[PDB]
C-alpha cells in the first residue's frame, strides 16, 4: 500500500507515535518519506552485507526481523520480516518503536540524518489535522 501523506500522519498519531521516546510525528513522517515513499511493500536487498530492509520504515533483517537468509542475524522485534510488508502497519509501528528504544534513537536510520535532522520538518504534517 502506498499511503497518502495526511492519511499516514493520522494513522501514525492514532498508533501513539507522536512524541514516542521524544520523537515528533513530523520526524516519523520524514523518515517514512525518505525510506520508502510511504510504501509498505518495499523490500530492498543489500548486496553488500546480505541483509534486506523491509517495509514503510525499511527495517533491517540483521537485527530486527527474521527472514532466515541473513547471516548472524537476531530478531529483536520477534517478527517474521513478512509482517513488515503488510498493508496494516501495526506490526511495523511496534517494531519501529522497539528500534528507537535503543540508545541511538531515531539516528539508527542514516536517511534520517541525511534528510531530516536539523531541517524544517513541519511540511510533512501541515494541513493533516494532527
Ligand atoms: Na533477523
Curated annotation (Swiss-Prot):
Disulfide partners: 6-128, 30-116, 65-81, 77-95
Gene3D superfamilies recorded: 1.10.530.10
PROSITE patterns: GLYCOSYL_HYDROL_F22_1 (PS00128), GLYCOSYL_HYDROL_F22_2 (PS51348)
Keywords: Amyloid, Amyloidosis, Antimicrobial, Bacteriolytic enzyme, Disease variant, Disulfide bond, Glycosidase, Hydrolase, Secreted, Signal
Listed GO biological process terms: antimicrobial humoral response; defense response to bacterium; defense response to Gram-negative bacterium; defense response to Gram-positive bacterium; inflammatory response; killing of cells of another organism
Membrane-spanning parts: none
Active-site residue numbers: 35, 53
Known EC number: 3.2.1.17
Assembly: Monomer.
Function: Lysozymes have primarily a bacteriolytic function; those in tissues and body fluids are associated with the monocyte-macrophage system and enhance the activity of immunoagents.
Additional free-text comment from the UniProt record: Lysozyme C is capable of both hydrolysis and transglycosylation; it also shows a slight esterase activity. It acts rapidly on both peptide-substituted and unsubstituted peptidoglycan, and slowly on chitin oligosaccharides.
Name this protein carries in UniProt: Lysozyme C
Species annotation: Homo sapiens (Human)
Amino acid at each position: 500500500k502506498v499511503f497518502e501523506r495526511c492519511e499516514l500522519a493520522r494513522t501514525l498519531k492514532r498508533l501513539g507515535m507522536d512524541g514516542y521516546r521524544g520523537i515528533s510525528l513530523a520526524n516519523w513522517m520524514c523518515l517514512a518519506k525518505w525510506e520508502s515513499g510511504y510504501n509498505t511493500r518495499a523490500a530492498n536487498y543489500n548486496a553488500g552485507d546480505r541483509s534486506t530492509d523491509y517495509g514503510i520504515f525499511q527495517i533491517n533483517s540483521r537485527y530486527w526481523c527474521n527472514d532466515g537468509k541473513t547471516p548472524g542475524a537476531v530478531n529483536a522485534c520477534h517478527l517474521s520480516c513478512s509482517a513488515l510488508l503488510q498493508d496494516n502497519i501495526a506490526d511495523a509501528v511496534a517494531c519501529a518503536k522497539r528500534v528507537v528504544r535503543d540508545p541511538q534513537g531515531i539516528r539508527a536510520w542514516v536517511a534520517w540524518r541525511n534528510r531530516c535532522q536539523n531541517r524544517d520538518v513541519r511540511q510533512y504534517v501541515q494541513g493533516c489535522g494532527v
